[PDB]
């Protein structure tokens, strides 16, 4: 187990850095890939890349050694960088859902509505929000619990557990995960509803001569739309569900499972290159890069 667990963490960091480096390289190097949507994909890839370089590796050690080897300052700063990048990943995922919703349902309105400069502001907003959810509260100790047993971890530099007060845990989890999850569900459900209402209008248009059935394109779209909500939810719902659970009754869910679910969330950062960069221009770029 502990030999296999250590090996498993290694390729997770490899997959994350490889994928996201490949994406950023492809977008930066290809004139054809520098679209509006891929600008938001670039934000996402940056976030997930920093996860693979700094965040996950230090998280790997803390599990393998069983303790924090780099002192209370870097514990805080690593924790702040972790929360920031995860917040920015999840919120950028949410922006992309919106961008594709508008690009598919209202394509002509969207072109005038969304400029490159407007997208840049949106990206900067997301990182600013991510910063203010992460660094500002964490470095200023607004997260801290009053509890003496929690305060023993804050005093010990070898302890780098993220034990938060009730208020932070709820607010930060809502802002970074639950609100984005709802927006993604709402947004992508209108994409489903728009497509299904449009298939209805074709059946009426025929004057009762044909009834449409799901073709190749519809089955794939619904699979794709599934993968997006599926992998995102699978990866972060467990960790963020448990994150609220421990606010009420801390003993119910064990520490090993809480950390196991956080590794599942780190796995998302490896999946995002696979989900969001399958376009034929991406595929061409990836082969040209390799």
């Amino acid at each position: 187990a502990a030999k296999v667990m250590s090996l498993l963490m290694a390729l997770v960091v490899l997959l994350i850095v490889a994928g996201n480096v490949l994406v950023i390289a492809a977008i930066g190097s290809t004139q054809r890939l520098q679209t509006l949507t891929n600008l938001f994909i670039t934000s996402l890839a940056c976030a997930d890349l920093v996860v693979g370089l700094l965040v996950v590796p230090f998280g790997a050690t803390l599990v393998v050694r069983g303790t924090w080897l780099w002192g209370s300052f870097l514990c805080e700063l690593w924790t702040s960088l972790d929360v920031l990048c995860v917040t920015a990943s999840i919120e950028t995922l949410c922006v992309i859902a919106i961008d594709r919703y508008l690009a598919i349902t209202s394509p002509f309105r969207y072109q005038s509505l969304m400029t490159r400069a407007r997208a840049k502001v949106i990206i900067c907003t997301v990182w600013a929000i991510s910063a203010l959810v992460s660094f500002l509260p964490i470095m200023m100790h607004w997260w801290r619990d009053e509890d003496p047993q929690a305060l023993k971890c804050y005093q010990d530099p070898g302890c780098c557990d993220f034990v938060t007060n009730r208020a932070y845990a709820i607010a930060s989890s809502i802002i970074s995960f639950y609100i984005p999850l709802l927006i993604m569900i709402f947004v992508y459900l209108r994409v489903y509803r728009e497509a299904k209402e449009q298939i209805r209008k074709i059946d009426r248009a025929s004057k009762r001569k044909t009834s449409r059935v799901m073709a190749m394109k519809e089955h794939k779209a619904l699979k794709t739309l599934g993968i997006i909500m599926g992998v995102f939810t699978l990866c972060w719902l467990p960790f963020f569900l448990v994150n609220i659970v421990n606010v009420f009754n801390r003993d119910l869910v064990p520490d090993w499972l809480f950390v196991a679910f956080n590794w599942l969330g780190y796995a998302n950062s490896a999946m995002n290159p696979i989900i969001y960069c399958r376009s034929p221009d991406f595929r061409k770029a990836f082969k040209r890069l390799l």
Partner: nanobody
Amino acid sequence: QVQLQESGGGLVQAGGSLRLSCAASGSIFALNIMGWYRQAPGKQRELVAAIHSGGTTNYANSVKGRFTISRDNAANTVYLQMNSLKPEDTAVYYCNVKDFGAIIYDYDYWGQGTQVTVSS
């Protein structure tokens, strides 16, 4: 395969009329844009007109008020009703489908092209 069959073009007198028609045979996702682009002699391909599945429409300035892009509500077929033609409208007109079935990106289809020539 998805294939785009263009028709309705040819020679015509200035101040005249034509009605292009592109019938898209094959599997297309319900959400899409059917459009007409044109490539004038020794010039870059430009948008003429385009119509979403929803029904919103976008025309290029030159052809505003004259041309009308409509689509068959039943089939995957799009019509560009070209009125009040001028010799500058002379070009190879290409049918186009932007297919949104991947969600994150869009896949394109282009017709072979059909010649429209407007004499003075």
